[PDB]
Structure 1
């Protein structure tokens, strides 16, 4: 059964993806109602140098936009900035607009990515929000505007829109309100990502999933207290756990309390010694405790 990333189904999101073109830039937009949200960098005359966005807005011609989906051409009637996103009002309303809210994702939380290639949905996969506000996915040219989403209790939330990839390979996007996650600039810059902080909540859930998979070599007879682990975590770029309550079910099923896995984290952070855990060679923090519980038990 192992442990793998899953994506919630994409049915409600795909009919909202449109191809947005301006000049030499071709990417994706999110068509909801008569609005189309896209990364505002699409109207940049040159993405190899610093962009003055209000200068580009004052020189924008709505007749140069090309917003389409399949065989429907959407005429742009108004353009406005909203943060780092471009909000374009079109002459047609999306007949397949789903009931939806807008939500911001926090660090250590999982969501789904509908990877779209120049207006065409191509694939869908699950990601996780790193401490600095980035994610580790797979984006290439023409995939900006790809939408992140998550369904909670039958409520569809749009949470992410892709903008850029940093030099270290981390991927940077914004919420649908135009606020960039982690506060990164939407410029072709050399800006750095901070030091990454592993979510210890997720590493413990990852280690519980490995015990359910019959992988127990990393568990010894040594325990480590919560307080002592939290003192170790802040000097080793791990978050501190508030409590062990979230793992009550996983601990009873596997026969290992959180304190046993906390000791494993400290030992395995120095290297797996040549062995693997769920095919990984390092600690994985992309699975929340709720994810692991649902994937293993439903």
Structure 2
């Protein structure tokens, strides 16, 4: 019993973290094979990154794995990343892929400082393409990952913090999530809404764990709820087939949970669910099914 936001074990990723310094800047890089990927802002003195790269000297990089320094062979621009070719292969490189996550999807953050992992926690990509993280100065280059059947899927490299404290990264192809600029200019995060499909998963976890106080007897159709959602800070429900097993196990259908969600808005905070805020949206159906059933 219980429900906790977990991270997948970080061991396979820890051996891939390096420290990348250039000039007055230091952040983290991801060392896979003979390449190190890192945020391109490490070479910044608006920033013209092409200019910054044009005047770069390779010998000005200092890249280290522990106290072992890596020789730099070349550098190429990759969107908001640098792909840095080094003279040594990381012998601890796992089987890996890259994948860009979409809003509402969960992944793991390995928070890194000075080229060393410091903490690990699960996150969920918000509708405004930010994550609710905990990062301070030096965290850039911290990777986000999922582990699928022994393959590490890298999906995020940390880039910056907006003014509101929101965290933004790029995918490993160098595409910034949400199209935010890797610049120190004033940008504000987009409007964010609670991810309803994840709230549904959470309420199913609650039912399985014996929490029923919030359960409505009323129902609302998906499309009518969706009209309400977009005027009430929640996302539309698009996928429902994923809930089939949870509905079967609990005997409670999605339409009933949707009515419950509407009602939870109307005394919001009056009571927790499983010790969480009642409209928690950080858990996906997959995470719930894993923690409930294995």
Same fold (TM over 0.5): yes
Q: Deviations over 1:202-233 (max 9, x none)?
A: 00111111122222111132122222212212
Alignment length, in residue pairs?
294
Matched residues in 2 for 1:82 and 1:118: separation? 22
Structure 2 residue aligned with 1:225: 221
Structure 1 residue aligned with 2:261: 265
Residue of structure 1 aligned with 2:238, choices 232, 239, 242: 242
Structure 2 residue aligned with 1:210: 206
Residue of structure 2 aligned with 1:279, choices 268, 275, 281: 275
Is 1:185 matched with 2:202?
no
Asked whether the equivalents of residues 203 and 257 of structure 2 are also in contact (C-alpha less than 8 Å), the reply is yes
Structure 1 residue aligned with 2:91: 95
- 1:282: Cα distance to partner? 4.5
Matched residues in 1 for 2:245 and 2:111: separation? 34
Structure 2 residue aligned with 1:62: 58
Q: Deviations over 1:241-260 (max 9, x none)?
A: 23532112212222321111
3-state DSSP class of the match of 1:31?
A: strand
3-state DSSP class of the match of 2:127?
A: coil
CA 1:190–1:290: 2 relative to 1, 3 Å: same
Q: Deviations over 1:103-136 (max 9, x none)?
A: 1101111111111111011111111011121111
CA 1:244–1:58: 2 relative to 1, 3 Å: closer
3-state DSSP class of the match of 1:248?
A: helix
3-state DSSP class of the match of 2:237?
A: coil
Matched residues in 1 for 2:167 and 2:230: separation? 25
Asked whether the equivalents of residues 17 and 28 of structure 2 are also in contact (C-alpha less than 8 Å), the reply is yes
Matched residues in 2 for 1:124 and 1:169: separation? 19
Matched residues in 2 for 1:270 and 1:210: separation? 19
Matched residues in 2 for 1:70 and 1:155: separation? 24
- The worse-fitting range, judged by mean Cα deviation, of 242-251 and 62-71 is 242-251
3-state DSSP class of the match of 1:205?
A: helix
Q: How does 1:1-298 map to 2 (within 5 A)?
A: 1-45=1-45, 50-298=46-294
3-state DSSP class of the match of 1:4?
A: coil
- The worse-fitting range, judged by mean Cα deviation, of 30-39 and 236-245 is 236-245
CA 1:35–1:288: 2 relative to 1, 3 Å: same
Q: CA RMSD in A?
A: 1.4
- 1:97: Cα distance to partner? 1.2
- 1:296: Cα distance to partner? 0.8
- 1:147: Cα distance to partner? 0.5
CA 1:252–1:131: 2 relative to 1, 3 Å: same
Runs (5+) with no aligned partner, structure 1? none
TM-score, normalising length: structure 1:
0.94
Asked whether the equivalents of residues 271 and 282 of structure 1 are also in contact (C-alpha less than 8 Å), the reply is no
CA 1:78–1:243: 2 relative to 1, 3 Å: closer
- 1:153: Cα distance to partner? 3.1
- 1:56: Cα distance to partner? 1.3
